[PDB]
Short mmCIF file of C-alpha atoms in Angstrom, two decimals:
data_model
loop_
_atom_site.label_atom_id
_atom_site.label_comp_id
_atom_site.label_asym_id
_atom_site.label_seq_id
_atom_site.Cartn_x
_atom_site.Cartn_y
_atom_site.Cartn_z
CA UNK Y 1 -18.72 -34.32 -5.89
CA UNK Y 2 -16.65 -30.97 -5.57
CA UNK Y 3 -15.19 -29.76 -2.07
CA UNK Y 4 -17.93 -27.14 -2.00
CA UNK Y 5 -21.13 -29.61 -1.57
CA UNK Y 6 -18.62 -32.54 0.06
CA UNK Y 7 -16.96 -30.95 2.49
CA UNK Y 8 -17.65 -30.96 6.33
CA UNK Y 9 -18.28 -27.61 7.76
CA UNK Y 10 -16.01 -28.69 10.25
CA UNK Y 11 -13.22 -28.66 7.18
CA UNK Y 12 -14.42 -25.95 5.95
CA UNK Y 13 -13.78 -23.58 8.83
CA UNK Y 14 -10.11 -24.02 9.52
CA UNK Y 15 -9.56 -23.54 5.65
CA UNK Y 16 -11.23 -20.54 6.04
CA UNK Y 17 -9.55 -19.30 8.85
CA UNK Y 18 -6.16 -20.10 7.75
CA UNK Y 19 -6.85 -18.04 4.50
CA UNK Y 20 -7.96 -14.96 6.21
CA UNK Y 21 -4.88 -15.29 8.17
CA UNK Y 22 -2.74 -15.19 5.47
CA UNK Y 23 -5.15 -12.20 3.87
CA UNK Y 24 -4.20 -10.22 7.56
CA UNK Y 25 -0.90 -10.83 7.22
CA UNK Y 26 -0.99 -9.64 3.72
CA UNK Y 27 -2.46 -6.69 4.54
CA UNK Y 28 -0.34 -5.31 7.41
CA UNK Y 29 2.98 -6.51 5.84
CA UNK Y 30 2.61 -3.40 3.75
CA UNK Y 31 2.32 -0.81 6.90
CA UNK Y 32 5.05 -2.47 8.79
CA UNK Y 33 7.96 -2.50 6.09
CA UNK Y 34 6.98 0.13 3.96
CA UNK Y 35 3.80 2.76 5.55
CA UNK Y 36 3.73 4.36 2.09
CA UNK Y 37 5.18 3.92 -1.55
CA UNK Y 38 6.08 7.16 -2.44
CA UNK Y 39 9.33 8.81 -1.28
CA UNK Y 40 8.81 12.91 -1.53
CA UNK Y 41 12.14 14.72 -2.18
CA UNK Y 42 12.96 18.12 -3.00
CA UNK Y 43 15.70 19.80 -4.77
CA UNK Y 44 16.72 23.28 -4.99
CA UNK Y 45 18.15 24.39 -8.09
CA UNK Y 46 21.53 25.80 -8.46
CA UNK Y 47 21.67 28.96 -11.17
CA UNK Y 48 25.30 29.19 -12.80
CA UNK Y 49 26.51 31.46 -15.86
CA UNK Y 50 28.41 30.33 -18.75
CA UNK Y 51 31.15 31.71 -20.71
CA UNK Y 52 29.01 31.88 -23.88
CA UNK Y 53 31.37 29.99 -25.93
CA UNK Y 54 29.45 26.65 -26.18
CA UNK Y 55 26.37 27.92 -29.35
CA UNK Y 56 27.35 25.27 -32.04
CA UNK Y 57 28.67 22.65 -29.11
CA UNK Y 58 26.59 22.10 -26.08
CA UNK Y 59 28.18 21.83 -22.74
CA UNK Y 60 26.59 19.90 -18.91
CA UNK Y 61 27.31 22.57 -15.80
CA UNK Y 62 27.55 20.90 -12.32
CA UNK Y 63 25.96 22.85 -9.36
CA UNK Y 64 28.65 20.86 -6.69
CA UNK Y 65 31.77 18.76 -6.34
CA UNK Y 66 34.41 18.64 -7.99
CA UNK Y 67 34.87 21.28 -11.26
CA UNK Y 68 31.68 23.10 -10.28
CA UNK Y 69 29.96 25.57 -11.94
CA UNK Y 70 30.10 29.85 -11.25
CA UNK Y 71 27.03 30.01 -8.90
CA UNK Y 72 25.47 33.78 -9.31
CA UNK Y 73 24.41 35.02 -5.44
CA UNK Y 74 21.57 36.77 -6.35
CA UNK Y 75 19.91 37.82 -9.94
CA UNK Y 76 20.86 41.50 -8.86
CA UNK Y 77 24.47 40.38 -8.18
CA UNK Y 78 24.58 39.59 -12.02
CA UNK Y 79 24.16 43.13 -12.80
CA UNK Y 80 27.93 44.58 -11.12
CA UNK Y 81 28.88 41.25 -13.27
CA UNK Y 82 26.67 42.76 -16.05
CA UNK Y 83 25.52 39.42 -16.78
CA UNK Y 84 22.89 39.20 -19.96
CA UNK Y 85 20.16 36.90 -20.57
CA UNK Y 86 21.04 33.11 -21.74
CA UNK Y 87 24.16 32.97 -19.64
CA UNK Y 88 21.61 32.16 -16.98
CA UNK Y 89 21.73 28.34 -16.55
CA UNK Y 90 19.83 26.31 -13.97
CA UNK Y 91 20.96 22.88 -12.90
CA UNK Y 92 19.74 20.02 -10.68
CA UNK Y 93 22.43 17.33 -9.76
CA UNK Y 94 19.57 14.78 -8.99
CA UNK Y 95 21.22 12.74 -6.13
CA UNK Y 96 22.32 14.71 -2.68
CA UNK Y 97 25.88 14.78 -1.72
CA UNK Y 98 27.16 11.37 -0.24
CA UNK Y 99 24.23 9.22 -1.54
CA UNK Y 100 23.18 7.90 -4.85
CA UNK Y 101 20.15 6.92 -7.05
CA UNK Y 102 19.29 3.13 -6.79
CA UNK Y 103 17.43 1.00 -9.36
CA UNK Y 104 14.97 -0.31 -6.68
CA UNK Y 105 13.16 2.84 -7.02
CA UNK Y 106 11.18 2.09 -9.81
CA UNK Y 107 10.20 5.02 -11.64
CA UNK Y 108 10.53 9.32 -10.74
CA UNK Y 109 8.00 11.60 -10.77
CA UNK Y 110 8.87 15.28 -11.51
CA UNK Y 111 7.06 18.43 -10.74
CA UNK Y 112 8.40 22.44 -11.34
CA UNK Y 113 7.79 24.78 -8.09
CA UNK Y 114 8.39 28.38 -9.30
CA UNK Y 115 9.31 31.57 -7.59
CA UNK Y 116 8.29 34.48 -9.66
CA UNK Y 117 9.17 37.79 -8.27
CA UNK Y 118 6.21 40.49 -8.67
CA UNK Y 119 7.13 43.56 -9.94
CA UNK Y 120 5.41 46.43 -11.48
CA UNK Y 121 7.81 46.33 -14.50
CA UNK Y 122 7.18 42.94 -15.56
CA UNK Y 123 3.42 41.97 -15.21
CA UNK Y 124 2.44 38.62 -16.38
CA UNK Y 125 1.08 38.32 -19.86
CA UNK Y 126 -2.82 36.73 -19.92
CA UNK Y 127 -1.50 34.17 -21.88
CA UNK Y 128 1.83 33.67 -20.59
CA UNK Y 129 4.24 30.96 -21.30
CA UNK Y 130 7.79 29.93 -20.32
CA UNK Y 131 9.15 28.50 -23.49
CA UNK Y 132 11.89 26.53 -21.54
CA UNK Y 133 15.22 24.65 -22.89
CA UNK Y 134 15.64 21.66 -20.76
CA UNK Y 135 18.40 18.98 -21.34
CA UNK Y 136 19.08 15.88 -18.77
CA UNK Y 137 22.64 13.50 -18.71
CA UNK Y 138 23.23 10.63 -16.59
CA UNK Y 139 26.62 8.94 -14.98
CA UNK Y 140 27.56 5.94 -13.13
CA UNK Y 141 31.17 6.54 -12.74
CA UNK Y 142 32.00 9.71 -10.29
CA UNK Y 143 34.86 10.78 -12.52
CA UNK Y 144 33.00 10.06 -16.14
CA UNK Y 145 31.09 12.27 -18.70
CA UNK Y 146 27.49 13.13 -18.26
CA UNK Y 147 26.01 10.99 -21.28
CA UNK Y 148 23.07 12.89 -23.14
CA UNK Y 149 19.49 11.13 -22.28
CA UNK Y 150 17.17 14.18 -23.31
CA UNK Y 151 16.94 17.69 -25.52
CA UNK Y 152 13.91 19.45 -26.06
CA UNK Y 153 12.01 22.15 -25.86
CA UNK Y 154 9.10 21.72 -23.85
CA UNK Y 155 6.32 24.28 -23.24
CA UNK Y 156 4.13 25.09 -20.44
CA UNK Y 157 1.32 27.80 -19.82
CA UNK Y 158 1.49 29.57 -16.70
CA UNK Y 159 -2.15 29.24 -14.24
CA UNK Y 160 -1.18 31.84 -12.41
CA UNK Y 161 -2.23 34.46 -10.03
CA UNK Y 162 -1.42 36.96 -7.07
CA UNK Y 163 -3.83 38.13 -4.60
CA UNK Y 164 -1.44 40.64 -2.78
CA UNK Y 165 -1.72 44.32 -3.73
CA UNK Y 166 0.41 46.03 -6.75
CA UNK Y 167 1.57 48.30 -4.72
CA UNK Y 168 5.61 48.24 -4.59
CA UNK Y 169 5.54 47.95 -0.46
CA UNK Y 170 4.47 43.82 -2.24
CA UNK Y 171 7.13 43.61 -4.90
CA UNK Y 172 9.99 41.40 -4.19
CA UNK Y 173 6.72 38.69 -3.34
CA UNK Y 174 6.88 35.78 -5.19
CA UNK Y 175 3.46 35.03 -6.90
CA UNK Y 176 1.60 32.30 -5.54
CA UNK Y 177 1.25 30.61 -9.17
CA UNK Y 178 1.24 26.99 -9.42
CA UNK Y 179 3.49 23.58 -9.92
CA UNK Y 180 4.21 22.40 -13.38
CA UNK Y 181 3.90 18.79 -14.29
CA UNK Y 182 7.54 18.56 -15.31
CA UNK Y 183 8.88 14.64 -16.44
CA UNK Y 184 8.52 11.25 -16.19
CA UNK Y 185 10.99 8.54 -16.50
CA UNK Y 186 10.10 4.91 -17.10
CA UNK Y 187 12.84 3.27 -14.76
CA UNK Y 188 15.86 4.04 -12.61
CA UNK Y 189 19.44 2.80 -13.90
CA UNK Y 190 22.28 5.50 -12.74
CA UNK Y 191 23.76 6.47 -9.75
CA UNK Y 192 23.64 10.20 -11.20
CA UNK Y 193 21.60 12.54 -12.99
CA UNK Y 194 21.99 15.73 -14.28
CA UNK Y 195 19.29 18.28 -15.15
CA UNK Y 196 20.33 22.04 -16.67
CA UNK Y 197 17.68 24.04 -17.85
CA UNK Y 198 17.72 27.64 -20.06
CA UNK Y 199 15.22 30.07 -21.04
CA UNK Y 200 16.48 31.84 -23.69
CA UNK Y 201 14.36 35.36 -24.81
CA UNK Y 202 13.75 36.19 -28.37
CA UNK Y 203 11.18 39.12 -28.96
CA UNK Y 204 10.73 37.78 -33.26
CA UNK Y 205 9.93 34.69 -31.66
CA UNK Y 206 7.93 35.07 -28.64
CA UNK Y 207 9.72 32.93 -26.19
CA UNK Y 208 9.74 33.55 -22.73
CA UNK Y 209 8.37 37.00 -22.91
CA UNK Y 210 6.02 38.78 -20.58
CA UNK Y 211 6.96 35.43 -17.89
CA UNK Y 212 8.02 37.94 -15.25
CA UNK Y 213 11.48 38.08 -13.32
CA UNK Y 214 11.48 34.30 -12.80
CA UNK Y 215 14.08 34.62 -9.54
CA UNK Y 216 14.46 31.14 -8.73
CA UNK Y 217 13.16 27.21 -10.07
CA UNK Y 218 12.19 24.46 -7.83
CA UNK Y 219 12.44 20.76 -8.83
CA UNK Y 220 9.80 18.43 -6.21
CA UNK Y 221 10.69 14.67 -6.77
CA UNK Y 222 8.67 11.61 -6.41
CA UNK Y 223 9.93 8.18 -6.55
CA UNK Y 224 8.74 4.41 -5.45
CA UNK Y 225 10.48 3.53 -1.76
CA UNK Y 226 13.18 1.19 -1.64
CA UNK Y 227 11.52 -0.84 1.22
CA UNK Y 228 7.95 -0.78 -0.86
CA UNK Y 229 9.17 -2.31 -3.95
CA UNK Y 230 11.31 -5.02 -2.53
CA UNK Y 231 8.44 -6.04 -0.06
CA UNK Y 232 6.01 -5.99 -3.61
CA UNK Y 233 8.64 -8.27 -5.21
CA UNK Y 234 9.01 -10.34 -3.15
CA UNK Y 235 5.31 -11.09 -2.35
CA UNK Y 236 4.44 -11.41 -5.76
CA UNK Y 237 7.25 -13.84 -6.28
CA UNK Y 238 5.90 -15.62 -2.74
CA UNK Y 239 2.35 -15.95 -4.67
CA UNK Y 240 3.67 -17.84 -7.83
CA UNK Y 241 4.38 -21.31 -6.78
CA UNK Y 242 1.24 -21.27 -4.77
CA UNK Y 243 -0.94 -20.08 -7.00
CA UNK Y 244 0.60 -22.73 -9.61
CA UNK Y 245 0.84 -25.28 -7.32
CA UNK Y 246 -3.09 -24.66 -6.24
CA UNK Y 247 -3.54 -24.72 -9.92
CA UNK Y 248 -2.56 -28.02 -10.74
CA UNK Y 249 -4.04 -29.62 -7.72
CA UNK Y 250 -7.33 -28.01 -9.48
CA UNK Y 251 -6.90 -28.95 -12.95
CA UNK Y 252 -5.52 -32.74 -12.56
CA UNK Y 253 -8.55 -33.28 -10.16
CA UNK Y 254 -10.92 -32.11 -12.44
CA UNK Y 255 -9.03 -33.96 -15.31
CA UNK Y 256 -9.78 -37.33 -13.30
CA UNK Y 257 -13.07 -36.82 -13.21
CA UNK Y 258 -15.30 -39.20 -15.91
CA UNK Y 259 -17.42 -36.34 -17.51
CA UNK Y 260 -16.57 -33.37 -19.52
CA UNK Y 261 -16.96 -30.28 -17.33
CA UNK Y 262 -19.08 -27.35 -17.93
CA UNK Y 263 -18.65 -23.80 -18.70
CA UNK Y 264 -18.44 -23.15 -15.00
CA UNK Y 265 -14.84 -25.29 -14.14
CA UNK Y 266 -13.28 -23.69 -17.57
CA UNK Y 267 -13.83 -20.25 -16.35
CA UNK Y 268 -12.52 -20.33 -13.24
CA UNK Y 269 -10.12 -21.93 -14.46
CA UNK Y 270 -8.88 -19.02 -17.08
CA UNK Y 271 -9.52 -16.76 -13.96
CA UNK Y 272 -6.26 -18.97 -12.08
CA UNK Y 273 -4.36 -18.74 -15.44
CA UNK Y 274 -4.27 -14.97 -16.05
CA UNK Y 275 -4.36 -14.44 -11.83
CA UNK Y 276 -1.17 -16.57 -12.03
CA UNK Y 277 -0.46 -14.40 -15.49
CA UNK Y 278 -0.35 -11.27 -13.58
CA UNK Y 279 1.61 -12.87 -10.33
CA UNK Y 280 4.66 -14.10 -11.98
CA UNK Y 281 7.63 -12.10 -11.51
CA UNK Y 282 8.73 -10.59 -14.71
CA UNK Y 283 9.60 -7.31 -13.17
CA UNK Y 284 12.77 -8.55 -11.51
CA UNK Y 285 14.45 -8.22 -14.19
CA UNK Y 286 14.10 -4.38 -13.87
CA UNK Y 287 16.91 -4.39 -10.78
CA UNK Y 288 19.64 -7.01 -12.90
CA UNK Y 289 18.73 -5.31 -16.58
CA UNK Y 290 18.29 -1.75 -18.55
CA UNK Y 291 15.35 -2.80 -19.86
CA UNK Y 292 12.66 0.06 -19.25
CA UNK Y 293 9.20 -0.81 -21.33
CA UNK Y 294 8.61 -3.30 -18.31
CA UNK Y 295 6.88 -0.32 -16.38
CA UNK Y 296 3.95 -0.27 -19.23
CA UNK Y 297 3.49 -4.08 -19.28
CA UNK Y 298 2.90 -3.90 -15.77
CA UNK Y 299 -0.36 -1.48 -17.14
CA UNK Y 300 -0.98 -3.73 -19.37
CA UNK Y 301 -1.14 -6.82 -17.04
CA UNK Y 302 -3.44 -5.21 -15.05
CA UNK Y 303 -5.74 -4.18 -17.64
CA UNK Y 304 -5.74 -7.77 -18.97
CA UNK Y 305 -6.36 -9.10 -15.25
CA UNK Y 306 -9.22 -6.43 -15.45
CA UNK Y 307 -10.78 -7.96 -18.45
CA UNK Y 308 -10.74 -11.46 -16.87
CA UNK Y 309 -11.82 -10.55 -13.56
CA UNK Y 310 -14.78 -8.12 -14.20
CA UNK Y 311 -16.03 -10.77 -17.05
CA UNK Y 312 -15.68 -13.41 -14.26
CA UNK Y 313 -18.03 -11.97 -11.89
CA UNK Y 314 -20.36 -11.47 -14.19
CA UNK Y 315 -20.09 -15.21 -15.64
CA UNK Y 316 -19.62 -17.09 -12.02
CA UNK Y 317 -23.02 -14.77 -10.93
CA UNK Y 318 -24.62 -15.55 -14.51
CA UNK Y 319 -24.51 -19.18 -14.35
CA UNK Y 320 -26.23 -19.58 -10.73
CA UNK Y 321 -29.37 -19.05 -12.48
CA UNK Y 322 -30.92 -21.75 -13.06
CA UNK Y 323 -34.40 -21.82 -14.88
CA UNK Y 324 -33.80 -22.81 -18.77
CA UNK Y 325 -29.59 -21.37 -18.06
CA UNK Y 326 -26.57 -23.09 -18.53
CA UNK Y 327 -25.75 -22.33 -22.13
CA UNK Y 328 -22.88 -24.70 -23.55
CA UNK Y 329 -21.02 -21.43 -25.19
CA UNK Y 330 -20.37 -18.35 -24.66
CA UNK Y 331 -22.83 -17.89 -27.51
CA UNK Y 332 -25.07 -17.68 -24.73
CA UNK Y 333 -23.31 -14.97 -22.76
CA UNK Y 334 -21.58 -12.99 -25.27
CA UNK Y 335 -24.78 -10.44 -24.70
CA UNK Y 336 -23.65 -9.20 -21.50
CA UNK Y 337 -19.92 -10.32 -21.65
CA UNK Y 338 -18.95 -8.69 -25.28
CA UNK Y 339 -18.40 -5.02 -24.03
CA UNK Y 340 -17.41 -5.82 -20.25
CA UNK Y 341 -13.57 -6.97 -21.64
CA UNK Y 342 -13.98 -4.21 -24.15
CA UNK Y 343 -14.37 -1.77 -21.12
CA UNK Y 344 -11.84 -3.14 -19.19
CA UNK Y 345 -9.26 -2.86 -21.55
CA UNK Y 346 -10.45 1.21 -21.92
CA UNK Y 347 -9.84 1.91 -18.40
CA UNK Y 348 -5.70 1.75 -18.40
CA UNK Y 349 -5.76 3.10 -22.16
CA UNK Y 350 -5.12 6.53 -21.27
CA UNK Y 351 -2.44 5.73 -18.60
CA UNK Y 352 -0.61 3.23 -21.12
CA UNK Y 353 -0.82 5.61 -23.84
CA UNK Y 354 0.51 8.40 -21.08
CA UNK Y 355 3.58 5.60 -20.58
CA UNK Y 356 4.08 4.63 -24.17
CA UNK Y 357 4.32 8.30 -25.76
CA UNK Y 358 6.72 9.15 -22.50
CA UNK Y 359 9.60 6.68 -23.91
CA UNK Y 360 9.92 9.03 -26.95
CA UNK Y 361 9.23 12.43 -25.16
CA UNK Y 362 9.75 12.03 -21.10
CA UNK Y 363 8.02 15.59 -20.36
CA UNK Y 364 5.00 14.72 -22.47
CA UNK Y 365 2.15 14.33 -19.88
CA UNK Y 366 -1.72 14.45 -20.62
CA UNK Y 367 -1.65 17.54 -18.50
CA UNK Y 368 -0.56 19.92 -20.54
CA UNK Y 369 -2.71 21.06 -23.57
CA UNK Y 370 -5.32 22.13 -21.28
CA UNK Y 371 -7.99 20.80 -22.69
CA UNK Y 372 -5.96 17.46 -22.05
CA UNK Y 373 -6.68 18.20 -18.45
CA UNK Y 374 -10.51 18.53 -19.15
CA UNK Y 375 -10.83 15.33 -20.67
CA UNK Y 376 -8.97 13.65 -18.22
CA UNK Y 377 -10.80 14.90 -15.65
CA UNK Y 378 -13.82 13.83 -18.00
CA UNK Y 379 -12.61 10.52 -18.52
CA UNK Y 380 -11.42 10.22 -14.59
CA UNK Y 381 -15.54 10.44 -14.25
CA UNK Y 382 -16.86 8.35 -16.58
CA UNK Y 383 -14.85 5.33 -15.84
CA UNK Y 384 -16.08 5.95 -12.27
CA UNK Y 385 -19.63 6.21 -12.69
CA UNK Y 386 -19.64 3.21 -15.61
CA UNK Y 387 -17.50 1.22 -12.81
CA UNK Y 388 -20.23 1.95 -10.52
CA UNK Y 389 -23.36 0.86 -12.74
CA UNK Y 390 -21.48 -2.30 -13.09
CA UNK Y 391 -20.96 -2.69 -9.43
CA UNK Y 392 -24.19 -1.64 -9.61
CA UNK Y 393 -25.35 -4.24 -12.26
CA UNK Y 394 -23.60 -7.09 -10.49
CA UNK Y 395 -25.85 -6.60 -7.21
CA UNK Y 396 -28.76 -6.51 -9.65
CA UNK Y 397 -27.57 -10.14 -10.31
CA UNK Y 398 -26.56 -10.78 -7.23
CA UNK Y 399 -30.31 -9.67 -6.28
CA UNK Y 400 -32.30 -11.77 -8.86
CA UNK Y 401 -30.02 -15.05 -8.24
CA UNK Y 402 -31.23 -14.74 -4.48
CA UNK Y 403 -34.70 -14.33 -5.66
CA UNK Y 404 -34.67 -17.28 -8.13
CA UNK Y 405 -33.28 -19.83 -5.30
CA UNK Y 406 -35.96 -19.57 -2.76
CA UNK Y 407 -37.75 -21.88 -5.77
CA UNK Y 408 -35.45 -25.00 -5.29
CA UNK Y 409 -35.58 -24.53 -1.27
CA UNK Y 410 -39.49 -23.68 -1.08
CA UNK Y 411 -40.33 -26.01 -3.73
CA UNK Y 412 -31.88 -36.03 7.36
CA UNK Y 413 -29.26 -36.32 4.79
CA UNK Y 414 -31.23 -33.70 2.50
CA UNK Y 415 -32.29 -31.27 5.32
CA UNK Y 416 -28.39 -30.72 6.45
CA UNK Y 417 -26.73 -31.10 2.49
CA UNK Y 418 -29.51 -28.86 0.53
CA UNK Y 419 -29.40 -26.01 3.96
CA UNK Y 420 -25.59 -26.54 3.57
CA UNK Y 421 -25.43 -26.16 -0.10
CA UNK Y 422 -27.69 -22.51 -0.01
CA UNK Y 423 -25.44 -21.60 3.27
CA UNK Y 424 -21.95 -21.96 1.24
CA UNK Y 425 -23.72 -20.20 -1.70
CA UNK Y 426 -24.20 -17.66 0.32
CA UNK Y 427 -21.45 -16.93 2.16
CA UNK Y 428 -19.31 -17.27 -1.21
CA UNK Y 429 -21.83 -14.74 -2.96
CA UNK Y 430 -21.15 -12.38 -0.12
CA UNK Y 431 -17.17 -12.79 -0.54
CA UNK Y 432 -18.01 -11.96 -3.90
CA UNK Y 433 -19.44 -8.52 -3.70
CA UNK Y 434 -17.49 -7.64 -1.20
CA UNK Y 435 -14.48 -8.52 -3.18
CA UNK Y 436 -15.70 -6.45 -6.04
CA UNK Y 437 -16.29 -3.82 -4.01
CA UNK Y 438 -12.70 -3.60 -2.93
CA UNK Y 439 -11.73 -3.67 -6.40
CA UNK Y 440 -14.08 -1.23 -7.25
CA UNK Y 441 -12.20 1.26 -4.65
CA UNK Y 442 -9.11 0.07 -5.52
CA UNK Y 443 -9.29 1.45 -9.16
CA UNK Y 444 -10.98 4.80 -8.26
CA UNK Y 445 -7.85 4.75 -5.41
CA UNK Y 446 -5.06 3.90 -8.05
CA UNK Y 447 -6.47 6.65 -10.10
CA UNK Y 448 -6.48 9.04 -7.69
CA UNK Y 449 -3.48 8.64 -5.90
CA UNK Y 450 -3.39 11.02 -1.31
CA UNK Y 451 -2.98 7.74 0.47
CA UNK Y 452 -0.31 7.69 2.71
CA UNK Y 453 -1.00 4.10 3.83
CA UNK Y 454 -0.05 0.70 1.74
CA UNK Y 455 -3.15 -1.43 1.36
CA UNK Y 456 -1.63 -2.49 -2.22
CA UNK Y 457 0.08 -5.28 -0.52
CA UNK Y 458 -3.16 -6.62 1.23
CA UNK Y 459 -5.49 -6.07 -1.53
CA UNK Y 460 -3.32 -8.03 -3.97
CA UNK Y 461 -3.34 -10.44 -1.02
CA UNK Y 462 -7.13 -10.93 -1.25
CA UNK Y 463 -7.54 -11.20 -5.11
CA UNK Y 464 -4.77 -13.89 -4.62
CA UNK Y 465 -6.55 -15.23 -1.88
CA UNK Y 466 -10.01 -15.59 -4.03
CA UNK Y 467 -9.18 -17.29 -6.34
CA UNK Y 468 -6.86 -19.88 -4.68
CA UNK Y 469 -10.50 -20.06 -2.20
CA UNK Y 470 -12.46 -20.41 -6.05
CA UNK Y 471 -10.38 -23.21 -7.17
CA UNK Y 472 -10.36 -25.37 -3.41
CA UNK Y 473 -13.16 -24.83 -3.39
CA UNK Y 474 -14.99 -26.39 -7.06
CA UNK Y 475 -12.34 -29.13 -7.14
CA UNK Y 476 -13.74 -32.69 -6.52
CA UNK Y 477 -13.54 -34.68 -3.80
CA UNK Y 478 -11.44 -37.05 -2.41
CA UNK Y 479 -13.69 -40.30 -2.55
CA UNK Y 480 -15.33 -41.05 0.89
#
């Protein structure tokens, strides 16, 4: 006697209805507060000259404020200042004047814009590369030191090309060559960062030869916005108790009942447990604490939710069939189930690995090492297409299950409960595709991201709201 062959269609409605409510709400909670998660900043470099007295003892150069650095006018103004080669530092001080960085943007996204002067004199190399020096500091205290975070070297080919005539009318024109996938950082804890950058020239060892007159660097930031993340937050921490508290409703109900239940109550009930796995807050302790591996759990999470989910569909779909089915283990399912979790797992593993090997080197990205870029493009395509043929699989399923239950029908309480029955199926199998359709796009879109717009909020709304519908809905019944 569960709520979904009970239950008065007359109950059922204003359930329904008060769910998709809360699934609208959900959904345009994101583009009121926050109409996009990304904040896109840009920061012009500042290109001071040192003393060259700091070889054995590094030293941080300011571009602003107070004890500033020398700022050079021009890269021909160095030359009445006969400047040479390696005095030439760049620096970024990360925040603007009269505002500072806040841990409620989550993580920052950095990407080099370069202005490369064409001249005849200095054509680029076929393979050239800017062998850069790069070394970051943060502060929290206006007046303290900047405290060392990175200091590496940190190559980068140039993919670069000018369509514009050699002729020397064109020189002085900046080639049009591309942005640089630059850094990563895991989390946001200081009011301040500082970024200074060399390029020191050796002819013995090849570095930074042949790069052209590099005149000026661009630094284009992207971090999480302030209102996104708190509105995320705070949902997530909204979903919780409900989710629990929908849980337990479920699972002492089912608990009262006089026979053992079948495989069907104990998966949907793993399905609340890692839903409610995923929902609880753990990543407020990112805006009271230091602690920064808590943006890769959050990868992991959601491949784990993945696993659950895309095995659930599968099992939930599985089990309406009826003829000689319902196996007592999943001895009887492991066929089809085995390499569906194994999947789902291998669709973050790049991205995690991307966010674990960043910790120890922050301008590591798959991007670089070209033929990292083919194979991520390669990989960005199979895990589409395999996501499809399962999409595709589970409307094969969804197709045969609809062809199997015409039996039972073909084959007044039993004219209104059996048509009622085959009408819930069916509007929950619907819900169902649909649903992993969404997800479906929701993956390829979490991958891929232009999207200016924030459906995260509602679409973490309706996975929410599934399952809490899933476990109303197979409960039993209050006794008539």
């Amino acid at each position: 006697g569960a709520i979904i062959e009970n239950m008065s269609t007359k109950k059922l409605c204003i359930v329904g209805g008060i769910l998709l409510v809360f699934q609208i709400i959900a959904f345009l909670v994101g583009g009121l507060i926050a109409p996009g998660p990304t904040t896109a900043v840009s920061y012009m470099s500042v290109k001071c000259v040192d003393a060259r007295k700091n070889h054995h003892k590094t030293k941080w150069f300011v571009p602003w404020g107070p004890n500033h650095c020398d700022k050079i006018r021009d890269i021909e103004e160095a030359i009445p200042r006969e400047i040479e080669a390696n005095d030439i530092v760049f620096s970024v001080h990360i925040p603007l004047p009269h505002m500072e960085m806040s841990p409620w943007f989550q993580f920052m996204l950095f990407i080099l814009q370069l202005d490369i002067a064409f001249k005849l004199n200095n054509q680029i190399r076929e393979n050239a590369e800017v062998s850069m020096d790069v070394s970051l500091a943060y502060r929290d205290d206006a007046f303290a030191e900047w405290t060392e975070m990175a200091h590496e070297r940190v190559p980068r080919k140039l993919k670069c090309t000018f369509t514009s005539p050699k002729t020397p009318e064109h020189e002085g024109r900046y080639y049009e060559c591309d942005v640089l996938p630059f850094m990563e950082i895991g989390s946001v804890a200081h009011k301040f960062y500082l970024l200074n950058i060399r390029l020191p020239v050796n002819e013995k060892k090849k570095i930074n030869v042949g790069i052209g007159e590099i005149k000026d660097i661009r630094l284009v930031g992207i971090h999480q916005n302030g209102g996104f993340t708190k509105v995320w937050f705070a949902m997530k921490t909204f979903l919780t108790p409900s989710i629990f508290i929908i849980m337990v409703w479920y699972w002492r109900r089912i608990t009262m009942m006089s026979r053992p239940p079948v495989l069907l109550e104990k998966v949907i009930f793993a399905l609340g447990i890692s839903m409610t796995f995923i929902n609880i807050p753990v990543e407020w302790f990112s805006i009271g604490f230091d602690w920064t591996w808590m943006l890769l759990f959050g990868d992991i999470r959601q491949g784990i939710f993945y696993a659950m989910l895309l095995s659930f569909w599968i099992i939930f779909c599985g089990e309406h069939m009826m003829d000689q089915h319902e196996r007592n283990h999943i001895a009887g399912y492991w066929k089809q189930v085995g390499p569906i979790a194994v999947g789902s797992f291998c669709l973050f593993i790049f991205d995690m690995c991307e966010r674990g090997v960043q910790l120890t080197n922050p301008f590591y990205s798959i991007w670089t090492t070209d033929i990292g870029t083919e194979l991520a493009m390669a990989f960005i395509i199979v895990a589409g297409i395999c996501l499809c043929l399962y999409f595709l699989f589970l409307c094969f399923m969804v197709f045969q299950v609809f062809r199997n239950i015409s039996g039972k029908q073909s084959s007044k309480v039993r004219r209104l409960h059996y048509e009622g029955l085959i009408f819930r199926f069916k509007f929950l199998m619907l819900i169902t595709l649909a649903c992993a359709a969404m997800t479906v796009i929701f993956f390829i879109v979490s991958q891929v991201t232009q999207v200016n717009s924030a459906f995260f909020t509602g679409i973490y709304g309706m996975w929410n709201l599934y399952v809490f519908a899933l476990m109303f809905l197979y409960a039993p019944s209050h006794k008539n």
